[PDB]
Structure 1
Amino acid sequence: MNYSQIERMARKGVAFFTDPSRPMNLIKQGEYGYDENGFEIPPMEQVIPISGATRRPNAREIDGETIRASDILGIFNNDHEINEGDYIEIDGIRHVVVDARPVQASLEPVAYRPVLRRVSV
């Protein structure tokens, strides 16, 4: 039981494999909604600082067109919970969190193991 113990251990573990020099940011957009005529723009960014761990790099090939893209998997803490379509900014390079994957056996997940795919293509 005692999920606070799992929480503290996960926090220390994530802090172990992290570098406090990589600029990482998290972008949450929301609350859109169209005009009576049918076109508008959502004016909100909601960017916040964050830090964590990354592993398993992979490259992307689409049809041989030389686009040179890459994707990552991550490990994070339980502050500023991750949603299913948020943006993660890494070193000036933006990725979409395609999957959250919270390491879970209870509510208020102890940590997240997201899968990131590079923006555009």
Structure 2
Amino acid sequence: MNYSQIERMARKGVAFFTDPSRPMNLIKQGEYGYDENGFEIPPMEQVIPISGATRRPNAREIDGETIRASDILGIFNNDHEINEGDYIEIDGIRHVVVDARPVQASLEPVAYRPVLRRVSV
């Protein structure tokens, strides 16, 4: 079976349920390393734009301390591959990609369905 046709269908479907006014960025900080004593920071941010769709909002409850946090799920495109420790800048709010969950039956996955949790607590 042809996977290019599936890629085109997935791209058009993602472009259907999307709004071209939500600012979404992506952070790929990496290449860390410790000093000869243990003092160093990763000097990479690598902010790039991205667009997609979101669904299923959910609220965070920890101890009844009224922290008022939330987390959602998203659907994205194949370019700018997502990893297991990246950050997503959704409407000025950072989320961490806990799960990548590519929609994959072949190499070079057609799309990604990451699971995002709000950063900090």
Distance 2:107 2:94 in 1: 29
Q: TM-score, normalised by structure 2?
A: 0.99
Distance 1:109 1:48 in 2: 20
Q: Secondary structure at the match of 2:6?
A: helix
Count, aligned residues:
121
Post-superposition, which runs of at least 4 consecutive aligned residues in structure 1 deviate over 2 A?
Answer: none
CA displacement at 1:37 relative to structure 2: 1.0
Q: Secondary structure at the match of 2:56?
A: strand
Per-residue CA deviations over 1:22-72 (Å, capped at 9, x if unaligned) read 000000010000000111111110000000000000000000000000000
Of Structure 1 and Structure 2, which has the larger fraction of its residues in strand?
Answer: 1
Q: Secondary structure at the match of 1:9?
A: helix
Q: Secondary structure at the match of 1:59?
A: strand
| Other-structure match for 1:62 | 62
Task: Name structure 1 gaps, 5 residues minimum.
Answer: none
Q: Secondary structure at the match of 2:45?
A: coil
Percent identity of equivalent pairs? 100
CA displacement at 1:17 relative to structure 2: 0.4
Q: TM-score, normalised by structure 1?
A: 0.99
Per-residue CA deviations over 1:84-121 (Å, capped at 9, x if unaligned) read 01000011100000000000000100000000000000
Distance 2:38 2:9 in 1: 50
Distance 2:2 2:75 in 1: 22
What RMSD over aligned residues (CA atoms) do the two structures have, in Å? 0.4
Distance 2:38 2:87 in 1: 26
